[PDB]
Structures are given as structure tokens and as C-alpha cells.
Nucleic acid binder design. Sequence first.
DNA 1: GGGGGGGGGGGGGGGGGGGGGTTTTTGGGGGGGGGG
DNA 2: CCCCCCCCCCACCCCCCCCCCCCCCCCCCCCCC
Lengths: 597, 156, 478
Amino acid sequence: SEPLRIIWGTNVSIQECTTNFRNFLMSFKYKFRKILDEREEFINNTTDEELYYIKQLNEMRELGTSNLNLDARNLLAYKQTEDLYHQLLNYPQEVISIMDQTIKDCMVSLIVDNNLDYDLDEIETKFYKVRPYNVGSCKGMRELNPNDIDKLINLKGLVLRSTPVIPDMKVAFFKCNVCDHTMAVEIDRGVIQEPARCERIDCNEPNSMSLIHNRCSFADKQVIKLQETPDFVPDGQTPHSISLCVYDELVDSCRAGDRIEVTGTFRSIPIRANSRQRVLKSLYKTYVDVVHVKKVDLAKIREVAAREDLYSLLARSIAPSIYELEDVKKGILLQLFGGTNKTFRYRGDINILLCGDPSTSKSQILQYVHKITPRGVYTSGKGSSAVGLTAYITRLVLESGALVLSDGGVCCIDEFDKMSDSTRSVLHEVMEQQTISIAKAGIITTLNARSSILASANPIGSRYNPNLPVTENIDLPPPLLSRFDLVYLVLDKVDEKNDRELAKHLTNLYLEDVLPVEFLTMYISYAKEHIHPIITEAAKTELVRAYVGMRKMTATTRQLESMIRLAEAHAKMKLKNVVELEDVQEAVRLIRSAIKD
Amino acid sequence: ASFTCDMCRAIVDNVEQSFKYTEPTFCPNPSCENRAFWTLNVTRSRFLDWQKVRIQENANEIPTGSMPRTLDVILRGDSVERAKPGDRCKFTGVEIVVPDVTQLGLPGVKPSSNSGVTGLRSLGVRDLTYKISFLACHVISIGNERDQEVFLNSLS
Amino acid sequence: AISSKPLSVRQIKGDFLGQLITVRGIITRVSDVKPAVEVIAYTCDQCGYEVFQEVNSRTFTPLSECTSEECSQNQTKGQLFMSTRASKFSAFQECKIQELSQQVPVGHIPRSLNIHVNGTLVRSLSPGDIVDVTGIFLPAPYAGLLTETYLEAQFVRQHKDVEERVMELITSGDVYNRLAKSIAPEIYGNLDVKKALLLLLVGGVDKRKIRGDINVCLMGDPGVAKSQLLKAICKISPRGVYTTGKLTAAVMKDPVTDEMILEGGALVLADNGICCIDEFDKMDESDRTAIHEVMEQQTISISKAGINTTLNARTSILAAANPLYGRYNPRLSPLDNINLPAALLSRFDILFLMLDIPSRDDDEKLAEHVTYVHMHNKQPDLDFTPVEPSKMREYIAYAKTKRPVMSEAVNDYVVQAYIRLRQDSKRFSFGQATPRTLLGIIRLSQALAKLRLADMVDIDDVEEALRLVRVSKESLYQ
DNA sequence: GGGGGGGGGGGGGGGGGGGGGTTTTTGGGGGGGGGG
DNA sequence: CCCCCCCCCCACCCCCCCCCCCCCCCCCCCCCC
Ligand SMILES: [Zn+2]
Ligand SMILES: [Zn+2]
Ligand SMILES: [Zn+2]
């Protein structure tokens, strides 16, 4: 007696699918998911009786936002919806459209059933999307086969590049040449359903409608190239790749170099032999049409900031695996904090170098600060394993080097003695001006590098000679060496009272399981976010008398500027908003140790 | 644009232009049989100064040193040539789609050879695609007059 | 009989078109799997009754007007739209087979043939497979009357339990000595080198990082012919790869098509395996920096073409290097004799300077061995029975997973032994003891402990690891 | 006064004609590195 | 420190399409019942 709305080719009723989804999208409780998964005894009513997707839709509607994330296992946890999971996997676009429409209907019905007043016109105007994810096993890109050609799949891989956003027409806009009447036409399966005659019966001219391109409505499309991860490849051949299409607010979900998951329908389409013909090649382009993407506190901060031993505590915590080099550790901690910037340029960078014998802990020290710092890099003074120090013009494009890439982070450079001369010259304007000047291919700019450098350098030959000065042992020239705030020597000279305890400390790491090593990054982050020290007036006189003292003892104003920056860094430590006399005194003292080399 | 018919001297005028070079479909003379045989009257028709300029994402605004994204900006009329290579600029105007005019059908041009949109009668079997471009109505830079009068008479 | 015969590709004359033939060759490249259409299915908007098009050709033309009588008998010009769900696709893959080095006549180029494989037979072929493929040899029109031609594959013939079978070798005994001798069994002597080379394969213990990888460089004369030893142990390892200095990762786009890919270098293929760097002294600075990053962080980084990444490289480096001026002078330093820098050499866990010394004793033995090979076309009898590679892989896997723990007695002993070595270090050469040599002693004794399948590392293992280190240090002088 | 038939216009379909469809060597400039 | 070398990068059939012609169909007008 009535028509039926059926998912084509399946005999699934769309009313049944709709209500099966509705009765989960409302009245599901998160406790059921722990029944499906392992560790079911961790169910807890005071956290798990929540109407999980009512909670999601409420926060979502208070944010007015269109998208819902949906772990597909939650369908299998709920009795009226376990079949909907199979329909979702096997017939995804229809089921997903049904789920989208159901989310919009839930939003509409909530503001009249839960009946709090809201802009019904806003919800009416808005589109809504489900993002199903964790659909199933992350089957290999190399394992896909033509049975997948309409199923919802899951992939993992590496983003190589993405197009700019591509406008994709959703509604064509037509205008009549004779009578200027206008009509909107939805694009159906990518085809413009052109009106052959003008709509208005009082005009009805044939072939008179014309497309007004910049009055059409466009969705956003983007194409991204995903390479097979080397974890999955067989050893003797190239990795594969798959192009994936991604739309609207999922555009620019990822960038070049991102390792990601995607959940998406595997799709295929024919391609033409030549554009002037309908003739199609007998095997289709394949792509995945994605619906979800994913990559790969203050109380304690203030509590720890009250401590008296904080300087030593934090300094030892940067590398507790390494035997005692404690003034180096203190210097590198102060480098992590850094000074302050000013408008007028003078900036907050602090720069450190380690020299002495090659076969010693300095490399591990650079590695540890690299692991700690938010956005630093590790490199060495010459060559390029597809990563190099200086900015460089190549094909035409400008590439930014490791110094420039380390903007706002510590740049760790090993083999700093063996650095090439053009690089040795280039370091001057980042040391002084924190920038590098580019003047080629019609582009002129001072490309701002804004990086603190931790250098690791070596003597000539196998051993450092401490009876000779640093300039006599090291290759790199004094005017560059002068720019470093703190400069250190680490030596392998035999002493059992050091070597035995080093060996016992080292060997004990294989047996054993205060050291806030994981809280260190959070402390550094909140300090850099919140604290901007200013110099006390008494600290002016302290800086002046200390500088004239070391001047009476070959100093330069670069040492005074260094003492300022170190004192400001010392004031970020302890979360102090104004540089104290003790901050100046420790900056002075540590520099007095360093300048004696 | 403005065109004179080949088989009679009548003139079509004020012909608006699409992205393709657009010629009249019908002769205004009720005597005349013409369609699509025309000569453009260069003197009666009006051109505008036009200049495409390519811009790239600012070096200090790229998030993690990846490639900068690019865009094509069209300047017209008095606004042309205010840009310069290496200059840092602020534009304002219209974000627009620009079709592949070859695919749309074009005199003297064989069409070109992402999936486009098709079915539109002008295309027949072909499918049309679009770039985004920015039609800028205004420009400023955000990154020797050696006579007294030309300097002084600009001051407050 | 023709389907039985294994032809070479150039023996496939045009007379064989349409016939079922079997071709012998090596697969030189393989396409990713793509869906070919068998039957296209069209929904009809204006009557619902679907229609179908079978496709027999490289190309087809899509249908538009509804040919079904449900439309046509009503003269209703309804519209057909293709549907993937109702269309029959078949798995398609294109491969190229090339005739083997023995099949090529004198002075000719090795000829090659496209293979088309459909259905369940897909991805039975990998590049580098040497294979007999039966198929229908067929033409395809594009030239005029010249034809494109391919082989429609039909059948594939490839040319080429453990957790208890490992107990055969465990109970057989003398496992370290015999397994060491079984690396390149025909190669005389150098059993200290062979003993060290094994501990690459079993590795040390990693811990939260502390690292399992062990690295060794085989320096000295080229007349020792160390390349074959690298080749041998590369084949032993389940994951390793053999390379030449003549390694870095790069965005190596335009491989076959003009096309984007990221090339993980051999150091990334060697992730969780051995990278065998032959001609190690000949490498360039990009590869030197690549080796530096993997030997320190066990990663190799990219900052190219917008791609910014670190690829995983948990790899052990086996290297072989040869001197300047052809032959090593023993009185001069390795730094005097060889192109490599000292800071890089310091990062290796073992350093072996295997020189070639003329000897009235050794040379007669080597000469008799080599002349036996020339006279009988096989190597002479070995005076012992070696373990074969797949059988020792049982043992190497068993030793790999049986990671030990450190002991207090070993802790005290390694400290005391290390301080004893630092007394000799107080003096010459770069071969003096360091914290990295102590880490080497620990990692190598752990490798020995793993090789004897123990739950704890032993002072026995420490003293043998110390013997290997001391022997290697003394080799730097002779 | 409504229905049928005849005649004229307008539209659609079918047919016919036409046009289009990358590595390897050589030279030059600039940059980088090594030896006296 | 200076100069020279050497290394790198770069330049004829088939389909789509358009025009022309013929027939058929639908409307309007006039006559007949
Ligand atoms: Zn109209
Ligand atoms: Zn005319
Ligand atoms: Zn139909």
C-alpha cells in the first residue's frame, strides 16, 4: 500500500537503519563499551552511566559545531545497533548519510523535547556530520583488492604532500540571458543538470540559461598522497602510495611528513583516454574518500617553585643518567630558560659550547636537551643527510636550514669544530642578529632564525691538551668562540675516584628501574609562557660592579649582555618576575667560571 | 566588446565578456542570416588594464617550515603594478573561481587534455574544472623626489 | 608439449601468439593491484531496471540512453549511471619479466615481456623472483600492423618445528665455536673476527634509551677480500642488506612514472637489522651524516620538499674499509692509512684491522685451497661440519628473544676490569678505553649471555667479551 | 453549440558531412675546497 | 691567504559535433450535424 525506502542492492530498510541508529545516538551509555572490551571489571557507575552521545551532542551544540567522532566499536557494544555496524562497513555512504541526517534530527528534536530555547533557524541552516573511526583492522595499503571497492576501510601511512584546496561545485547557479531570471541546480553525481528551457512559463526560451560560475556554491576538496609506511613494506621493492580525497573542515587535517590513520570508503572511478572523448580506460583509478583522520599542572608548578634546592634539582634532572658535570648541567638548564626580548634587536637566546675529548658524554648531553626542548633540532656542523645547517636555494625554491628550522628551540650541533667555512661565516648574523640574509631569485629578506645553539666540538686529533688554550686545541676561530655565553671542557683524563664512580653509575642503569624528568618539560613550558623578568634597580649596580671587576681582572660588553641574559633566565627559574641580586650573582659566578676556561 | 557582422555591416555592442573570449550568437538585423561570423571592432570595444600577480604565504607565518601555499591575484585598472617582486602586501577584493577556459570551448584553441563537472551543453562530453583566484580591487605594501616643492607640498 | 617447455623471452617468436606457453625469467618490476572491469553495471534513473556492459578491451565507451525495453518500449529516453557496487571488477596487475643472464646471447641486451595477471593469481609475482610463468601469449593493438604483446598469466612456478629443532643444536654443543666457524665456512682463520661478527646478529639488551645494536668495522688490506665475509653475514641475518660507500634517505621522486615517493635508504631497510657497508672509506658527506644520525639516535631525518620526518633506523652497522695507496702500512695509524675520520671510528664497538701478511706457511694453504676450487669446481672438505643458514636462524631467533638481566657480581667485575684497562689507557692510538668501551663490554657480554640462552649475564661472558675487545685492540698494531 | 476534419506551422529526429587527435652531452657561470 | 681546480646546476579511422531536411504531430479554424 506504500513505498519503501531501501538501501539499494541490500533490502535494508532505511527506516529501520534510522531508528537503530537513533536508539544508540540517544540512550547509549558508556558502561556498555567496557563490557565489549577487555578489563570489564573497571566499569564504574558514577563515570559510566553517562548518556555518552547526549553529552557529546550537548557540548557540540554549545559549541555550535557540525562534527561528531564515533568509535565504531560502540555500535557493537549496543544490542539494537550491532547490525548497523555491519551495514556501516558494507554500505557506508548510505548509512553515513542516514547517520548525518539523524544527528541533525537529534539536534532539532532536543531543543523542542529537552525544550530549552535555542536558534532553531541556526540548526536548520547547519549541516551535520558523523566521523566513524576505528572501523576495523588497519589492513595494508598493499593488501587492498577489488572486493573493497565500496567498503569503509582503515589505513595507516605517511603524508607526502597535499594539493591546495580545490573548489568542488555543490550547486550550479544559472541565469537566463533574455529575462535575467535565476535558478539554483544541485550537482548530482558530479553532473550539471542543465535546464534546457527557462523555468518561467512567461519566458520559456530554449537554450537561454547560462552558468554564472562565481555565483555557484562550492564545497572544499583536497587530494593528499599517502605513502605506505616502511613498517609494512616487503624488503625488496618500493613502497606503494594511495591518493586520498578529503573534504570541508577535514581539509588540512595533516601536513607533509605526518604519519596518520584515515578511516574512509575505498572508492574507484574510471579515467579518460583523451578529454575530447567519452572513451574510458578499462581499469579504474582507486582512492579512499575519508571520513575521519588522526595522527600517529599549575598547582604542582607553584608547589615545586617554592623549593630552595630547585636550581640543583632541575639541573641534575636534565640528564641523571650522566655522571657529574654539574656546572654544565646548570648552564644548559639556564639555556633552556633563556632571557627576554625587547622592542626598539636584543633577544632572549643563550648559547653554549662543549669541547674537550671526543669520546665523552657531550653527545648524550646534546641528545637529552634535544629530547627536552619543544621545537629544537639535532644536526652536525657539515654536510646534509637531506638536512643541513644553512638556508639554501634549490629546485626553484628556498629551503630553510636546521638553524632556521630551530626557530624558538635549541639547535644542537655536533662536530662543531669540523664545520665548513661558509657555515662558520653564516653563524655570525644568527649569533648577533638572530637572522640570516637572503638576496636571490627576486626575494630579499632577513630570514629570522631565533635559535639558541648548543654546540659540541672537539680537539684536533684524538686527545685534548689542557696545557694549551682552547683556541690552540680547537679548530674553530676565536671570534666565533667568543660569541658563546658559556663554554665548557669535558675530558677523559684518568682518575679512579671519578672513573670508578662513573662506571658504577653507568652499570647500575642496567639493574635499577627526586628526579622530575617528565615534569621538567611542563615546568619549562609554563615558565616560558608566564614569566618575563625585568631587571631590579639594585641589580643595575650589581651588574656594573661585577662587570668592572672582571674588566679589571679583559672583558667586553658582550659579557655584560650575557650576564643580563643569564640573570633573566635565572629569574624565569623559580618563576620570579623580577631579576634579583642573587640572580645577577649566579649569572656572574657561572660566567666567571666559564671565561677562565 | 563590439562586433560587426561579416555578411552585413550591422554592429553588436556592449557585449559583456565571460572568462572566454565571447562573441555574439545572433545578428541584430532581422534580415540577416548570420551566427558566429564576426569581426571585433577594436576602436569601439573597451579594454581594461589587467595584471596577474602570484603571492605566497608569508615566511614568518608558515607553521613548521613546510612549503608555503600560493595564490593567483588579478589586479585591474588603476590598481595594476602597485605590487612588486619580493614585496609584502595586503590586498582586498573578491575570492573567485576561474574555469579552465580551454575546456570550456575557445576560438582557435584545442581543449586541454581532478575530475570536473559535466553535462553543461557548452561542454558536450568535456568536464569543467576551476582554479581559485583573488580579484583584487585594492593594494598596499606593508613591507628621489629631489626638489623642495615636490617634497614640501606633500607634508602636513 | 609446448606449454611444458621453459622458453627464454627472445625465443618467444611471433608464431607463438595465441598459444599457452611457459616462459623462464626474472621479474624486474611489478605494478600495484588495480581493479579492471569485467561487467559494468548501470542503474537507470527513470525506470530502475539496471543494464550491463561486458568489457573485452583496453578501453570502452560508457552507455547513456536506457536500452532496456522497460524504457525503450515506452520510448522513454532514460539515463544510465554507472554503479561500482553492482559492477563486477576483477583484480588486475601488470608485471614485466626479463630473460636471465644465462639466456642473453653474446653482446645482446636482455629482452623483456609484459605479464598480465588476473583474478586469484594476482600478487603471486614479486620483483626479483626467478620464475616459470605459464600463460597465453597474446597481442594487443596500439605503428600500423606492428603489435604490442603480453603474456596472460595462468600458472606460476617459483625457483626458490623450530622451537624444538633448535634443541638439536643446543644438545649438539660447542655452539659458539661451531656457529662462528660457520660464518663463511670456506674462509680460513680469523675466528676472532667471526666470533665478533656473530654478536652483531644476537645483539645486546636495550632498556629505558640503552641500545641493543653492536657495530664493527673491518679495516686493512683489500687483499683479504673482506667483501665476501660481509656478503655471507648479510645473508645470515633475517633483515639485513648489503651496500657500498660508492645510504642516506631522500625524496627520490620520478621513479618510473613522474611520481612522488620518499626513499628510505638502506639504513632504514636495515631497521631492526644489519646494514653491511662495503667500501666504507669511499662514502660522501651526505652518507657520513646519515651514518652519524643512525649510529647515534637510531633515526634518519628529512627536511626536504616540505616533508619533515624522522625515519626509524634501529640498525647495527657492519663496515669494511680499505687503505689509501692500496696497502696498509702497519707502523702508521689507521687514521694515516684510511680515509675515515677518527670521531666516527670512535663510535664503533669493535674495530678489527685484518692485515694481509705474506707467509711461507699460510700462502701454500691458500694456494692449495684456491687451486682445488679451480681444479674440481667446488670448495675442499672443511675438516668440520658447518651449520646451514636457515638452521642457525632458529638459534639466532631463540638467542634474540632470550634477553638476560644484569647481576651484581658482573657489575663489580666490569667496573674492576674497566679500571684495569684505563691504567693502560693512561699513556699511541685511539684504541684506549672509554665509557663507550665499557658500554661495549656490557653490550657484548650481554650478547654472549643471549647466545648461551641464559637468564643472567656471567663473568664468563664478560671475560670473553673483554678478550674480544683486547684482541681487537691489539689487531690495530698488527 | 459542439465535434470532426483539414490545413498549416513548429519541433524533433535522423542522417550526412567534417574535423581533430627523459637522459645525455656541451658549454658556461658560480661556489666551494685543497695545496703551496 | 691566494689561486686554481673541480664540482654543481642549468638549458587513417573513429567520435564528437553540427547542420540540414523531412515528416509528423498538435493546434486552430471552419463547416456540418
Ligand atoms: Zn527566461
Ligand atoms: Zn548580419
Ligand atoms: Zn530505463
